[PDB]
């Protein structure tokens with residue numbers, strides 16, 4: 065099939081900022097380039113579009129082209145007759161939204177656009193709904209080819225592929241998912257089909273926070289079951305509230321507001337009475353020790369927290385499924401889709417616009 | 422001041438169900454009784470109301486009375502002079518709602534009602550909105566004397582006191598907050614003034630999930646700062662999104678649905694590319710090892726997950742703070758507090 069990868073992968077990032085060969089392994093080029101080369105070796109008609117093709121060293125550029133990858137800077141031409149479009153594009157500056165919007169009217173009928181490690185597919189889908197409508201591209205599907213790893217390293221043995229599970233409205237067809245599974249297995253990668261909104265939580269660099277919080281939830285569950293002897297429903301409420309609170313505080317107030325509003329000293333003091341079996345609570349013990357030295361490891365965040373003050377009120381623990389359900393009864397489903405869209409767009413904007421020098 | 426503590430504390434739970442003297446320390450009585458004794462030793466006029474006072478052993482009851490605590494079974498009488506009413510009341514059965522509603526018309530002018538770990542103060546305030554209006558008790562304050570520990574153990578060195586921070590309308594006055602700070606400080610306890618909605622996630626037993634997830638968010642931040650060299654916005658975007666999804670999965674589909682939908686095998690495979698400095702990532706390494714043995718540690722949940730099927734759809738990643746403000750604009754603040762109350766009820770009742 066005809067596949068176009070948008071984004072080569074910053075050669076300088078993967079060698080001078082993060083020493084990928086030493087930290088993870090393999091050899092350059094890494095990123096979308098490595099993905100394209102793999103597809104080309106498997107017999108697919110691959111094109112790779114990046115604005116900085118000319119900056120690629122000849123030695124690297126020859127390897128890619130010798131695989132069968134056509135290199136170009138023209139995103140529009142690259143999209144023509146493409147069945148699969150993989151966005152290995154920047155999170156910053158809305159670049160992933162802009163590129164997807166540019167290529168939208170030129171993709172072949174029933175094409176599928178795929179996000180990777182830099183963007184969640186539903187957020188992209190939210191940004192594109194007006195373009196989709198005006199251009200009549202309701203045939204375009206939306207899913208993912210999330211390497212959940214750096215392509216080109218030995219750890220990349222898989223792709224996370226977004227499905228429609230848990231979605232009120234589908235974003236991808238079975239025919240489109242099958243093409244993504246084919247690209248994965250054709251290149252010896254295992255396909256993990258995941259509900260669309262779980263792809264980025266599982267696959268992104270933030271798997272660090274996803275996994276720690278998941279294992280931490282399980283640890284609390286065991287303490288609740290074995291030591292406290294409390295009810296399952298109370299345990300689940302506490303887990304959901306904790307994680308919703310942290311998410312909402314980071315969303316609205318960032319890490320500085322998270323630290324100031326929860327109050328580390330209060331958390332430390334409170335946690336002492338939930339260290340009930342040190343041997344069975346390795347995460348609790350470590351967390352309590354990390355909190356004790358927090359002023360030494362993140363002094364810049366502590367300083368920002370001292371100077372933080374919440375300018376707007378909020379509720380941090382309101383479960384999103386309840387808010388969505390209540391909203392379904394207050395307004396039409398047509399209106400609700402717009403509200404969910406604007407909420408995903410505002411999430412991206414508020415978080416990326418907050419980062420001010 | 423005049424303080425009334427509602428609830429002695431389950432003598433049975435703190436010895437037979439949970440061995441507090443061994444696991445934590447101290448000696449009985451634990452709970453509301455220990456709090457009342459501390460206030461009385463600080464010179465306050467303390468009253469403790471409980472329907473099962475006569476079921477308290479004589480040796481323990483004498484210790485409490487000798488400190489100056491007046492024991493009674495009449496909740497209404499105990500409220501008539503109480504400037505501060507602390508609800509050391511049960512977890513289930515709506516007993517806290519029942520007690521708070523019964524004493525509301527009898528509390529002194531400008532009195533403050535305080536919940537502990539068994540009830541979010543915002544949930545109680547929401548429940549009582551109609552009673553506050555019909556009884557004309559808009560002067561009554563609502564806060565917490567949350568011990569975030571078992572009173573009577575050496576770990577109880579503090580109180581979490583709910584404030585109006587993050588609220589759109591006040592639930593307590595500064596004068597009332599000062600009274601609670603004094604009660605804490607008079608008994609040698611540190612007063613932690615937190616936004617009302619954060620007292621539960623910081624003080625309750627869920628502090629385990631709050632602290633670990635918080636620490637894991639900081640660990641990722643340090644990794645992004647020192648190793649990945651990525652921007653703060655991307656780090657925050659991924660934290661908020663990840664914890665939003667996990668939260669929604671637990672709320673709507675339970676722990677069984679979380680395990681089935683998230684895919685532990687995918688998580689383990691993904692996490693391999695983010696263990697970039699084992700010494701700087703103690704939580705990541707520990708979490709990665711715990712994920713490998715999950716089938717052994719929680720087999721009953723694995724069996725529930727294998728039989729789980731999502732019956733209804735929901736957008737697990739819809740950002741809660743954004744939806745909160747959309748709801749506020751449509752139907753106002755009381756409905757949002759009502760949602761917090763509806764959430765609490767589903768899991769603490771029936």
Ligand SMILES: Nc1nc(=O)c2c([nH]1)NC[C@@H]1CN(c3ccc(C(=O)N[C@@H](CCC(=O)O)C(=O)O)cc3)C=[N+]21
Pocket residue numbers: 074153154155156181182212213214267268269271649650651652655691692694695
């Ligand atoms: N399970 C897992 N998932 C990952 O996604 C993953 C991983 N492990 N191991 C670590 C590598 C490294 N990595 C980066 C992605 C984007 C930028 C990045 O900064 N991108 C900028 C572009 C900077 C620019 O060139 O303008 C942006 O999208 O805004 C950096 C690093 C993902 N990784």
Ligand SMILES: Nc1nc(=O)c2c([nH]1)NC[C@@H]1CN(c3ccc(C(=O)N[C@@H](CCC(=O)O)C(=O)O)cc3)C=[N+]21
Pocket residue numbers: 292293294295298334335337338434438511512513538569570571623624625626627628
């Ligand atoms: N920072 C902190 N906050 C706490 O809230 C905290 C703590 N540390 N350390 C330990 C105590 C103990 N604890 C219990 C939780 C649930 C039940 C519970 O579910 N009891 C049920 C059932 C009792 C039974 O088993 O019969 C009930 O009272 O209805 C009991 C006790 C939380 N604690």
